[PDB]
Design a protein around this ligand. Structure first.
Ligand SMILES: [Cl-]
Ligand SMILES: [Cl-]
Ligand SMILES: [Cl-]
Length: 129
């Protein structure tokens, strides 16, 4: 599913991501924009052989099981395929664990490089929320 911008903002809020660990909704929408362009089915293969999955490009080295990432963990206790669903519940619940891991949203390098320090409120501007 490719979400609309405000549609995704609403879904993220519904699932308790708004201001989670102090990160406003615009931060999460911005991260999703640059990680996946709002496409739940996004996948990308990393140089280390791990893969990133879903709207927030969650990585199989630590967070989910895909059966093809040697030496990896599955800290969210989910198959990576769950992160590709039209229902963002699994991605949100896993993102909550990731952002609580110590480095906040810096875990998403694209958030650090493209969202951090910017006017992230623009991502939810106009949205009925
Ligand atoms: Cl915001
Ligand atoms: Cl594996
Ligand atoms: Cl980047």
């Amino acid at each position: 599913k490719v979400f609309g911008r405000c549609e995704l903002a609403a879904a993220m809020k519904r699932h308790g991501l708004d201001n989670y660990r102090g990160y406003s909704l615009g931060n999460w929408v911005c991260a999703a924009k640059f990680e996946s362009n709002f496409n739940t089915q996004a996948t990308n293969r990393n140089t280390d052989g791990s893969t990133d999955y879903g709207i927030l490009q969650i990585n199989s080295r630590w967070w989910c099981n895909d059966g093809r990432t040697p030496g990896s963990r599955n800290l969210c206790n989910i198959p990576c395929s769950a992160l590709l669903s039209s229902d963002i519940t699994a991605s949100v619940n896993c993102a909550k664990k990731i952002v609580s891991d110590g480095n906040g949203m810096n875990a998403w390098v694209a958030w650090r490089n493209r969202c951090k320090g910017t006017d992230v409120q623009a991502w939810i501007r106009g949205c009925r929320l």
